[PDB]
Amino acid sequence: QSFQQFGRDTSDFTDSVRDPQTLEILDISPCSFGGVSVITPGTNASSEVAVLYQDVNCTDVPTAIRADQLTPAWRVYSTGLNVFQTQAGCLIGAEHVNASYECDIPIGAGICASYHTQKSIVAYTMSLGAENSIAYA
């Protein structure tokens, strides 16, 4: 409005503010920009992990986590060569194979990951079951 300085949500959280100098509206977003899942084998087995981001595109990953403001150890899980796009979101840290085994670690949306063979974390489409055919007459 003409006299408004800041807007409010339904949770009484300020989402927009008016700049006192060069009057215009600025939006405010949280720094914790999304939900993150960590996919791991046992620590006694290995120490490599995979990271799942919810409902983002794998182009849009190093803008949704602010990769420039993070340590370089986190920066290797923002981009890379083993990126994969699922219906749940973007999975980085595990390569994608074409085979279909049983489910070990259920990632979501039909994907299961396992510590297959050096050994590394792989991602695959889970197998529904053994294919069978019956001859009707």
Binding site: T10, G35, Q54, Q87, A88, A109
Partner: peptide, 22 residues
């Protein structure tokens, strides 16, 4: 607002097209 306040909904494991196969 739910996504901005840490409330997330995880997707189900089995796709509806996978339930259709069963």
């Amino acid at each position: 607002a739910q996504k901005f306040n840490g409330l997330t909904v995880l997707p189900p494991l089995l796709t509806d097209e996978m339930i259709a196969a069963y």
